[PDB]
């Protein structure tokens, strides 16, 4: 699957979780930002790699990054 990693410059504005079409991302409790929340990627096996989360991220270069990796039926987005 692809690898989605969240860096510590997150501000917890939850926009990556909203942008995600395949439910990879979720918000968890945290204490390193004012909103007290980071994004987390437990379901990277559902990640198709479309990078809407990186489009949605407001920090100057990307608290979240998708690293494209091996291809599966889910990551290639095949209905067949």
């Amino acid at each position: 699957s692809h690898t989605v990693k969240i860096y510590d410059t997150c501000i917890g504005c939850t926009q990556c979780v909203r942008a995600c079409p395949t439910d990879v991302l979720e918000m968890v409790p945290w204490d390193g930002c004012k909103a007290a929340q980071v994004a987390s990627s437990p379901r990277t096996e559902d990640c198709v790699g479309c990078k809407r989360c990186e489009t949605a991220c407001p920090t100057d270069f990307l608290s979240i990054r998708v690293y494209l990796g091996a291809e599966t039926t889910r990551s290639m987005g095949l209905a067949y």
């Binding site: 989605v4 990693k5 395949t22 918000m27």
Partner: protein, 136 residues
């Protein structure tokens, strides 16, 4: 396993192919206050039932697109399942019981790096070691 009524449409060729019986299959369930017309992710118009609905789909992204559409109909109780050819039904969305846009306790940080991205090491420092630059 899953209780619900199939929405009213005369069928499409955009539905689910041989991957459903051989690899994996998804289902979305929701309840509606009334019977109204929605658009299928496969294409076409369909009427949902007043009450419990069940609509089998080929991909998970179909269910999350449909669940994003059902929010425009003020419907927020939708559930997405993953079904294997053995009959194994697992509940994936929302997995925690709370939608992932809201913080719930009991969730842990997965794949968090405690540094900024410009602080990743060089590729030549990690060469032949079997690790990525963005690992840990």
């Amino acid at each position: 396993t899953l209780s619900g009524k199939t929405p009213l449409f005369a069928g499409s060729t955009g539905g689910l192919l041989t991957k459903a019986v051989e690899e994996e299959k998804y289902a979305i369930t929701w309840t509606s206050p009334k019977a109204q017309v929605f658009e299928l992710p496969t294409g076409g118009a369909a009427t949902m039932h007043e009450g419990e609905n069940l609509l089998y789909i080929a991909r998970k992204e179909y269910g999350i697109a449909l669940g994003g559409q059902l929010r425009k109909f003020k419907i927020t109780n939708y559930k997405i399942y993953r079904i294997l050819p053995s009959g194994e039904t697992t509940f994936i969305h929302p997995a925690d019981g709370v939608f992932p846009e809201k913080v719930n306790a009991g969730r842990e940080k997965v794949r968090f790096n405690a540094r900024s991205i410009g602080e990743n090491p060089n590729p030549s420092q990690v060469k032949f070691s079997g690790k990525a630059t963005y690992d840990a």
